[PDB]
Structure 1
Amino acid sequence: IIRTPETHPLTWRLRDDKQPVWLDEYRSKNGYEGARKALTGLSPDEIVNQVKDAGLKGRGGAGFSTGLKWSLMPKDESMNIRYLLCNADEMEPGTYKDRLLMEQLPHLLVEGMLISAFALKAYRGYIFLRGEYIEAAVNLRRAIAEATEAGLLGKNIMGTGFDFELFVHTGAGRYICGEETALINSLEGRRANPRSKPPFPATSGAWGKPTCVNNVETLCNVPAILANGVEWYQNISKSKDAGTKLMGFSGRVKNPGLWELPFGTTAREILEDYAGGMRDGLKFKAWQPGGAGTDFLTEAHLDLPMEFESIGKAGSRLGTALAMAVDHEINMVSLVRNLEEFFARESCGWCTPCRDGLPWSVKILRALERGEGQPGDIETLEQLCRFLGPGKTFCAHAPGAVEPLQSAIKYFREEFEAGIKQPFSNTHLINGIQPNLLK
């Protein structure tokens, strides 16, 4: 499968031996020309308007447009200290796009942060990276050094006068650090408890200064827009989401991997053609479209385009667009138990519903695994689903945690009632006291 630059704006310059493309090869393969055009012939407001016209949405699953987020900066010159943050955490399970895209293409991310910092007048950028990406950290630091010695970073960048510095902040392995307010809190060396919005980070973010936090894939889509134009960027595919996306299936498939595809591509073409369908003797039962924090879907929803709006009314989220396939042999009770165990061991411990309701669901699913379920457990899980929705908890970790549970209850309720065996016992007999035998 070939990858021309016209339909693969991110992965066309990859190498077959999975080696990192360094500064000379990247510059040979149309490197920093968009950054040069932006920093020479374009005002920062012109770049912001071009990004807004390009319709660049948030690649982190939120779907928020990048132009509107960049337009939320105050116009005051007194608040001149502005910050750019790259969310290279990627702590969500079933998400491996950032590792591939920054292990062999770090200069693309460097150029994207350079353009996004010049468009926001931010003098400092921080790549908040997870601690498990050792090779990616080494490649990113080497790329930063190569850009610094070539004059692409630091003071008086390419003779323009804009001064920008780049740093890589390696995280210490916490899933809630991917939340942008919690990313700011973890960046400041604090416990990564999230912050309450309003105020948004665009007004008071990193150390009170205005801050823009962007995903890795958005900052990699930026140089393609700034180098190959905007009207070309909107003419990649006839869909409601301009640009491409790193998409692919994983989990007991013939060819698990990552491919750059335009929006509107249905999941069956990703499964049956790119992933080669299921393995031998494995019948497809369910799939998750956007990682561990999204609603499960069945084979009926497999013939559906993978867009934000297409999956939004389908009853799930597009997310990171890295789908997971589940066959029959995996018990859904054990799968949801592992999901809730991950979400209950990676909570930040700030607010009551997530902190003191995810262990209850974990214990209920553990009892359902061993056949120790009691009448009133599925109702408790449904109550947890009802009372951990958007706005009930302090941050958005818990709605995304309870979405797979509600989807497995909606679509696979027969496997949950197979774990309820013993009657509801909560009290033991006390001799001398006749119990209140309620009805």
Structure 2
Amino acid sequence: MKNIIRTPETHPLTWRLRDDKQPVWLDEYRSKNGYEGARKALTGLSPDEIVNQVKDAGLKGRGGAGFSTGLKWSLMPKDESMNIRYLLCNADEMEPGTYKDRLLMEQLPHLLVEGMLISAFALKAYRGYIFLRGEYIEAAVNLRRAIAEATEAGLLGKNIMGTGFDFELFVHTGAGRYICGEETALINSLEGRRANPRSKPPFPATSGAWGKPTCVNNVETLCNVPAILANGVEWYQNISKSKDAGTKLMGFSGRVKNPGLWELPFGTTAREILEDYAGGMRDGLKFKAWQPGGAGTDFLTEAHLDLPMEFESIGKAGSRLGTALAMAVDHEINMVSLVRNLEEFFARESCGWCTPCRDGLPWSVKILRALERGEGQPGDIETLEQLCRFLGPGKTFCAHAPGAVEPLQSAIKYFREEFEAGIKQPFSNTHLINGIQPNLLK
């Protein structure tokens, strides 16, 4: 649909985007009601009032899990002797199928800077880091320029707007691992270590970066913050009649007519996104599957296309909303090859810490390669199902491996015939030894 009207009331995140796809700098941002929410926060609201305001707005985590942001902010310690607090922006965004944070940071960097300013004032966080992936070169340039402009305009640094609040914002560019987006592994990479995740509890709100209170939030959550504090809680609760408040960047990608990204309210069905916004599938292509929220979510069928894009509805269907950036799979795509590609990514992006991911994802990769070459053997599908069961939530140290086995689960559940078509050889892992008669098991 070309006729998209981006009013500031209905499109808080994208109404000040430019038609020539150019970044909005400080003069244009402040012309379009920029840093008004930051001014209201810093000059007329206590940090606890801002935390409760975000909690009452119902801002959920836009990184994929949907944890409540006000609840995460309220879990910082009430001890006044801890004042070395850190606010981290997870600008990693390494999930295959996810490109929303790239748009947000490339074209609206001051929105992210303002959201970090408001959130850092609410959390009493003296320092802030944007943990940005190393491949977003233009995002790094735009974010550093926006931080320099906000520093020269007095919006960052010492004594911001005369309030006495000190906030320093850094941009830390990454060195390319998918596990660096997991928040405790993000904290470990921020400290110059290998990016292994950490066991929770303790959560980073009490013991995070360098043992201090730390809050890790996605780019899009912090970008939702300034509109909440500039327009109010009631406005944020009165733009969607769904249990997930506010707007979300959703989009369809992969062999559709118009792959892209649009800001939509929660409860928008996947079918209307795919048809009205993405334009439907391309010419001579038949829709066969879709992933709702990136490479770590379960595949869904055509019958699930009428589901509203919410956490509860997609969760009730045997998947999860994720990043809400769906990927469409046409009939010309073989599911065994697609899942082999997915598991190859997931197995080589293991951090190596815990046994089931590190040593059973490569086993799934090798089974899928055998099925893709037609050299599958009996027991391979059962081994894949056992791998799916035993890499679920709680069995592995972090959540990388359950997300890895979600597409394998759903592809075996729905498109099992391709997987059974992979099996063509009799089972064997023993060669014959000459003087020894084998134990012929039944």
- How many Å apart are 1:63 and its aligned residue? 1.2
Residues of 2 paired with 1:35 and 1:298: CA distance? 43
1:307 match: 310
Runs of 4+, deviation exceeding 4 Å: none
Task: Map Cα deviations across residues 357-412 of structure 1 (whole Å, 9 max, x no partner).
Answer: 00000000000011100000000000001111100000000000000000000001
Alpha-carbon separation, structure 2, partners of 1:102 and 1:193: 26
| 1:249 corresponds to which of 249, 252, 259 | 252
Distance of 2:93 and 2:52 partners within structure 1: 29
- Determine the C-alpha separation between the residues in 2 that align with 1:136 and 1:195: 28
Q: CA deviation at 1:251?
A: 0.2
Q: Distance in 2 between matches of 1:244 and 1:141?
A: 27
Give the whole-Å Cα distance in 2 for the aligned partners of 1:145 and 1:438. 72
For residues 149-169 of structure 1, give each alpha carbon's deviation from its aligned partner in whole angstroms, at most 9, with x where no partner exists.
000000000111000000000
How far apart, CA to CA, are the structure 2 residues paired with 1:113 and 1:379? 48
Give the superposition deviation at 1:2.
Answer: 1.2
For residue 47 of structure 2, the aligned residue among 34, 38, 44 is: 44
Query: For residues 418-433 of structure 1, what are the structure 2 equivalents within 5 Å?
Result: 418-433=421-436
Distance (Å, rounded) in 1 between the aligned partners of 2:356 and 2:13: 41
| Aligned-pair CA distance for 1:325 | 0.4
- Which of 337, 361, 366 is equivalent to 1:363? 366
Q: Are 2:57 and 1:54 aligned?
A: yes
Task: Name the % identity.
Answer: 100
Distance in 1, matches of 2:264 and 2:241, equals 13
In angstroms, what is the RMSD of aligned CA positions? 0.5
How many angstroms does 1:224 deviate by? Answer: 0.3
Partner of 2:210 in structure 1? 207
The residue correspondences of 1:263-342 to structure 2 (distance < 5 A) are 263-342=266-345
1:136 offset after TM fit, Å?
Answer: 0.5
Q: Equivalences for 1:25-424 in 2 at 5 Å?
A: 25-424=28-427
- Aligned equivalents of 2:159 and 2:206: distance in 1? 27
What SS does the aligned partner of 2:59 have?
Answer: coil
- Cα distance in 2, alignment partners of residues 434 and 10 from structure 1: 72
What is the alpha-carbon distance in structure 1 between the residues aligned to residue 251 and residue 200 of structure 2? 33
Distance in 1, matches of 2:83 and 2:99, equals 36
SS of the residue 2:83 aligns to: coil
Take 2:127 and 2:23, find their aligned partners in 1: how far apart are those partners?
25
Say which SS state the counterpart of residue 430 (structure 1) adopts.
coil
CA distance, structure 1, for counterparts of residue 357 and residue 180 of structure 2: 16
Give the match's secondary structure for 1:297.
coil
Over residues 300-333 of structure 1, what are the superposed CA-to-partner deviations in whole Å (9 max), with x where a residue is unaligned? 0001100001111110010000000001111000
Unaligned ranges ≥5, structure 1: none
Distance in 1, matches of 2:89 and 2:123, equals: 14
User: Offset at 1:43?
Assistant: 0.5
Query: How much does 1:354 deviate?
Result: 0.2
Counterpart Cα distance in 1 of 2:67 and 2:273:
25
What secondary structure is seen at the aligned counterpart in 1 of 2:225?
helix
User: Number of residue pairs matched?
Assistant: 439
**What secondary structure does 2:418 align onto?**
coil
5+ long unaligned stretches in structure 2: none
Q: Deviations over 1:35-85 (max 9, x none)?
A: 000000100010011111001101111111001100001111111110000
Work out which of the residue numbers 3, 7, 15 in structure 2 matches 1:4.
7
Deviation for aligned residue 1:237 = 1.0
Q: Residues of 1 paired with 2:360 and 2:130: CA distance?
A: 33
CA distance in 2, matches of 1:399, 1:80: 36
The one-character-per-residue Cα deviations of 1:191-248 (angstroms, maximum 9, x if unpaired) are 0000011111011000000000000000000000000111011000111111000001
Deviations, residues 96-144 of structure 1 (Å, cap 9, x unaligned): 0011111010000000000000001001000000000000000000000
CA distance in 1, matches of 2:152, 2:275: 46
Q: Counterparts of 1:209 and 1:296 in 2: how far apart (Å)?
A: 39
Alpha-carbon distance between aligned partners in 2 of 1:312 and 1:326, rounded to the nearest angstrom = 20
What CA distance in whole angstroms lies between the structure 1 residues aligned with 2:289 and 2:441? 41
Q: Distance in 2 between matches of 1:295 and 1:33?
A: 40
Distance 2:126 2:98 in 1: 30
CA distance in 1, matches of 2:409, 2:18: 42
- Distance in 2 (CA, whole Å) between partners of 1:86 and 1:158 is 23
Displacement of 1:438 in angstroms is 1.0
Distance in 2 (CA, whole Å) between partners of 1:299 and 1:313 is: 16
Deviation at 1:426, TM superposition (A): 0.9
Provide the TM-score with structure 1 as the length reference: 1.00
CA distance in structure 1 between the aligned counterparts of 2:181 and 2:162, rounded to whole angstroms: 35
**Matched residues in 2 for 1:197 and 1:247: separation?**
30
Query: What TM-score results when the alignment is normalised by the length of structure 2?
Result: 0.99
**Could you tell me how far apart the structure 2 residues matched to 1:256 and 1:68 are?**
34
